[PDB]
Amino acid sequence: VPEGYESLLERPLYGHLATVRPDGTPQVNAMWFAWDGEVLRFTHTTKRQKYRNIKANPAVAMSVIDPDNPYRYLEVRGLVEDIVPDPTGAFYLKLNDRYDGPLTEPPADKADRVIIVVRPTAFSKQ
Amino acid sequence: VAVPEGYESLLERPLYGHLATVRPDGTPQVNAMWFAWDGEVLRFTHTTKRQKYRNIKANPAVAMSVIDPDNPYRYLEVRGLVEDIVPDPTGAFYLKLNDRYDGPLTEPPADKADRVIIVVRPTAFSKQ
């Protein structure tokens, strides 16, 4: 990550995750995310189009901008490298906690929850 | 294609839109952008010299994500097609976008000779 920009990834900001649909056209959805210094993790259910997109095309990109300073932003390109079942909704609650989210209990859709793990290939800030 | 009823307000606000395009190799690109909405089409400022432009010349399909900055449960996803690309060699359109956002970019850009207006007609909206 280029120098001075990793802090974007540490903050509880909404990332805009782009995927490619089966028809070859793009889709973009605003998302919580977690960065661990190596990979990005997202909460998803197996029911939505964005999940189906990544099962067929694992290449993704995520945009984040600093809400306090429009000069600071990042596009992260990467590949989905794992999809991990989260049937207790523990990972959803971890994100909820980082974002001071409204859930007080595991999500009702927990049986269908997964963790999408994305390993970056590029970070661009300009 | 009609905006969902009461969400057009998000497109009227000076919020960033995160515009996704697809590269010729089939992988996506997404960038935070100023946009303008006139009730029918979205307009963006680009130059002819970057990858985002090359992406749209080969695949006109795009998607834009805008989120309310204070309530993240309020959002709008717009899919659409680039239907025009208009030269902006004076940077006048770029300066109108800056004005819409009350931004600091009040003088024409050094790259103005290569500036264009990208015009996108929506094909779909989602807010849930």
Q: Do B77 and A25 touch (CB under 8 A)?
A: no
Note the CATH architecture for domain B1-128.
Roll (2.30)
Question: Which of B40, B5, B59 lies closest to A23, judged by CA?
Answer: B59
Q: What is the DSSP string of B7-65?
A: -HHHHHS---EEEEEE-TTS-EEEEEE--EE-SS-EEEEEETTSHHHHHHHH--EEEEE
Rounded to whole angstroms, how far apart are CA atoms B87 and B85?
Answer: 7
Name the fold adopted by A1-126. Pnp Oxidase; Chain A (2.30.110)
Token pair for B105: 């970019």
Which residues from chain B sit within 8 angstroms of residue A100, using beta carbons? none
Q: How was this structure determined?
A: X-ray
Q: Please state, in angstroms and as integers, the Cα–Cα distance from residue B119 to each residue in A56, B50, B122, B127, following that order.
A: 30, 17, 10, 22
Pairing mode, strands B42-47 and B28-33:
unpaired
Token pair for A126: 């300009």
- Give the H or E element holding residue A95: helix A90-98
User: CB of B103 within 8 Å of any CB in chain A?
Assistant: yes
Q: Which of A25, A28, A57 sits opposite B65 (nearest CB)?
A: A28
Decide if B36 contacts B45 (C-beta within 8 A): no
Token pair for B89: 């060699």
The total of other beta-carbon atoms located within 10 Å of residue B88's CB is 24
Question: Which of B11, B29, B6, B5 lies closest to B77, judged by CA?
Answer: B11
- Give the H or E element holding residue A6: helix A6-10
State the resolution, in angstroms. Answer: 1.2
Name, in order, each residue with C-beta under 8 angstroms of B12's C-beta and a sequence gap of 6 or more.
Answer: B37
Question: Which of A35, A118, A108, A48 lies closest to A82, judged by CA?
Answer: A118
Q: Which of A59, A60, A63 sits opposite B31 (nearest CB)?
A: A63
Rounded to whole angstroms, how far apart are CA atoms B107 and B90?
Answer: 10
The total of other beta-carbon atoms located within 10 Å of residue B6's CB is 9
